[PDB]
Amino acid sequence: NFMLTQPHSVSESPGKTVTISCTGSSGSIASNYVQWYQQRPGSSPTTVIYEDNQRPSGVPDRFSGSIDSSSNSASLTISGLKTEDEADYYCQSYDSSNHVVFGGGTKLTVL
C-alpha cells in the first residue's frame, strides 16, 4: 500500500523559490518514477515533471524535480515564482502492483 505524502499548503512571494515535497510511505520513492502535475480549478492536470526530473517541452525551466533517497522523498522546486504559478500540485507514482498513486496535493499561494 505505497502512499505519497504531501503538505497541504505552501506560500511564497513573487520572484522567490518554493519547494513542495512528496514523501514515500510503505515503500521506497526510488522504486518507480515520480510525476508532478499542476492543476487549476475544474481543469485537468498539466504535467510539469515526469520521470523524476524531466520537463515536458514548453514547461518553463523554473520548474524542477528531484529525488532525495535519504529522506525517501521527491521534491518539486519552483524558482522565480510567478503569480500564474498559484495552483494545486500533485505528485504521482506507482505502487508494487503498478497501480497509480497520488499525493494528497499541495496548494501553492503566491503572496
CATH 3.30.70.2750 fits 1-111, yes or no: no
Nearest Cα to 82, choosing from 53, 61, 55, 106? 61
Q: How far apart are CA 73 and CA 21, in angstroms?
A: 7
Please name the method used to determine this structure. X-ray
Q: How far apart are CA 47 and CA 28, in angstroms?
A: 22
> Where in the chain are the domains?
1-111
DSSP letters, 74-97, are EEEEE-S--GGG-EEEEEEEE-TT
Resolution (A): 1.9
C-alpha cell at 91: 505528485
